[PDB]
Every structure is written in C-alpha cells, then in structure tokens.
C-alpha cells in the first residue's frame, strides 16, 4: 500500500488532479486495452488511443461494434468512432461518446513513434516478467 510520501491519497485532490488535467495528461488518461491477439503481438496491455485507430467497443449499449477512430475529444472524455451514431429528433446523425476505457483497440495505427512507444512499454513489462 502507498509508501511514496509525495503522492496524494485523498479523494478531493485526486478528483482535482484528474478533472483538471492538461492535454498531455489526458493523453495518457485516454488509454484503451489492446485486444487479445494484439496483446500477444506487442506484449503490452494498454496504450493511449490515437486518431486513426480501429477500435471495437465492448461495454456500452454498442458492444461488438467495430469502427475506426474519427474523433478523440479530450474535453468531454469521449471518443467518436466511425458510424457509431444515433439520430436526433429532427433526424440528423450525431456520434455518441464511448469512454476510452470501455473499448479495445482492434487495429493499431503504427506510427514510428508508436513503434518506439511499444518497444519501451514491452521491454518494461518483460524486465519484470524476467
């Protein structure tokens, strides 16, 4: 249990530090767990989601629906993926927000820096597996 005497263990301060996060902190808060085969591939559990990732929802009323990420919208703590839409009363289509911890990244947008990121995370996990 907590031993570092510089990290907070208070509800008030944790909620503050969470809801008042900048963009660079919300990036890392906006992580999802890689799917099964993709975890076997990269030996990492979770990764901050991107613009052009293909996710598959798992817990909303939209389970088992797959789609590319089209909008990661850090201000409402939501994402919008392709076609995951509902219809307004007047008939327009609007995306519904899926919280990033309630999806899995089915396909991963391997940018060069995402490649280096997965290298560092995987070696970190394997230095404690070994």
């Amino acid at each position: 249990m907590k031993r570092n005497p510089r990290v907070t263990s208070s509800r008030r301060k944790c909620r503050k530090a969470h809801f008042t996060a900048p963009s660079s902190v919300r990036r890392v808060l906006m992580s999802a767990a890689l799917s099964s085969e993709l975890r076997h591939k990269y030996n990492v559990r979770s990764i901050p989601i991107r613009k052009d990732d293909e996710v598959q929802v798992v817990r909303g009323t939209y389970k088992g629906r797959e789609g590319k990420v089209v909008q990661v919208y850090r201000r409402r703590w939501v994402i919008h993926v392709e076609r995951i839409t509902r219809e307004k009363v007047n008939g327009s289509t609007v995306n519904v927000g899926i919280h990033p911890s309630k999806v899995i990244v089915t396909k991963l947008k391997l940018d060069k820096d995402r490649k280096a990121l997965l290298d560092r995370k995987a070696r970190g996990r394997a230095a404690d597996k070994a």
Partner: protein, 252 residues
C-alpha cells in the same frame, strides 16, 4: 487525532453594530450601509445566519490523553491473556472452527516466505484462512459522511501474525491481506491486540516470537522482565471457578 476547529476570525469579518431599541426590530448587531440584501441582516450571533458558533472550538482542546505507563503495560498483558482463550476469541467474532490448537503457534520457517500466494498457502495449513476470507469478503464502503473524508472502505479484522526475528520478510508478505496484520513481538500494540475495546484479537504466533514472550514480559518476579518497573498483575482470585468454590467440601 489531528486537531480540528473553526477559524478564529469566523463571523467577525463584518463590522456590524446594533440598531438598539426604537426600531421595532430585535437589538442584535446588524450590518451597516446599503445597496445589498446584507444591510439590516444580523451578525455576530450564534443564532444568526452568518455568525459564529457558540463557543467556537479551539485547537487547544485535549486531543491526546495520558495513561500511566504501568497501566498501558497492565492493559497489554490482559490483552494477551484474553487471546489465549478460544471462547473469547470466538465471542469477539473470529471464525475459529478448524484452527488446530490455542494459542496457535507456527514454526519459524514461516518467517522466510516472500509472496502473498505463499502467505495464503501458509494460512491454509492453519485454520485461519476462513478468517482471512471473512475479512476480505466483508469489505465495503463506509456508510455516512465517512465515505467522503478519505475513509471509503471498512472491513473486519483477521489474524494478527506476530513475529520475533527482526528484518525478516513476512512483514511485507502479509501486508496486502485485508484484515490481516503483522506485529513484531518486542512492540506489541494495544490497537492490534484488542480492537474496538473488545477482548481477544485472534493472534497467530511464530515460534521465534512465542519463545521470547517470557523473556519480554517475565513472571511474578522482580526484574524478571525486559521492561523495568513491572511485574505481571496478579488477580483478585487465584481460581475463579465458582463451581468448585460453591461446590467444594469446605463451603458445602
């Protein structure tokens, strides 16, 4: 405890002064000026919205109390003496129905383990994993205003493993278990040995600790103990079996 008290200057950051008699209103200090709803509203009272409280708490209450050092020692000895009873350990709520013998002792090879998988493996041999399970399945969110002051979760209490050999590693193994505590035997703590003020925390001794209890506490002998100025309290009856008193030949 940490001292709590309202700020000294509360209720007195307004410069209100009473209207006195002759204004068809009460004589209580009232806020001056105009332009806001505030004008005419009473201040400085305990009775008024926006005043002090009666006898505002102050930091110099008696948060800590003192007890005679010998009375702490008496209390901790009578905390130990009550655990060696299965009936009071049960009445205090612990699940002891497969535990082999009281007061329960394990070998010192327990001291060498490292992981909590090993710790649960150890508690399977003893009869106390039922108690650890009670502690773990009782965990819940603390009802009331406690669930928002950084005290979300409560639980029950489990076996207090007592070791004697300093620097070993079970202290870090039994930690993650809810309800389960670890205490060195040199410094037994009353908050562990009798939670809630109730007698009989279910204690699990290792052999190393158990064989140095008597070198710590001593006997009915002056200077027996490791603790200066203390001999074990003697009771007001050597044998409190009213059965044999009221039913022995001499009385009857």
């Amino acid at each position: 405890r940490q001292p709590y008290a309202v700020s000294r200057k509360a209720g007195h950051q307004t410069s209100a002064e009473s209207w006195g008699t002759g204004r068809a209103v009460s004589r209580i200090p009232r806020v001056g000026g105009g332009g806001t709803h505030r004008a005419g509203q009473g201040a400085f009272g305990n009775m008024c919205r926006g005043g002090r409280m009666f006898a505002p708490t102050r930091i110099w209450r008696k948060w800590h109390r003192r007890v005679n050092v010998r009375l702490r020692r008496v209390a901790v000895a009578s905390a130990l003496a009550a655990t060696a009873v299965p009936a009071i350990v049960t009445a205090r709520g612990h699940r002891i129905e497969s535990v082999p013998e009281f007061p329960l002792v394990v070998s010192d090879s327990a001291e060498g383990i490292e992981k909590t998988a090993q710790a649960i493996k150890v508690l399977k041999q003893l009869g106390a994993y039922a108690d650890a399970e009670k502690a773990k399945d009782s965990v819940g969110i603390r009802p009331g205003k406690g669930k928002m002051r950084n005290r979300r979760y409560i639980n029950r209490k489990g076996p207090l493993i007592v070791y004697g050999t300093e620097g070993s590693k079970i202290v870090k193994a039994f930690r993650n278990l809810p309800g389960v505590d670890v205490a060195n035997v040199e410094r037994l703590n009353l908050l562990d040995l009798a939670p809630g003020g109730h007698l009989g925390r279910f204690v699990i001794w290792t052999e190393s600790a158990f064989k140095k209890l008597d070198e710590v506490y001593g006997s009915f002998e002056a200077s027996s103990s490791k603790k200066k100025g203390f001999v074990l309290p003697r009771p007001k009856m050597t044998n409190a079996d009213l059965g044999r008193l009221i039913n022995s030949d001499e009385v009857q």
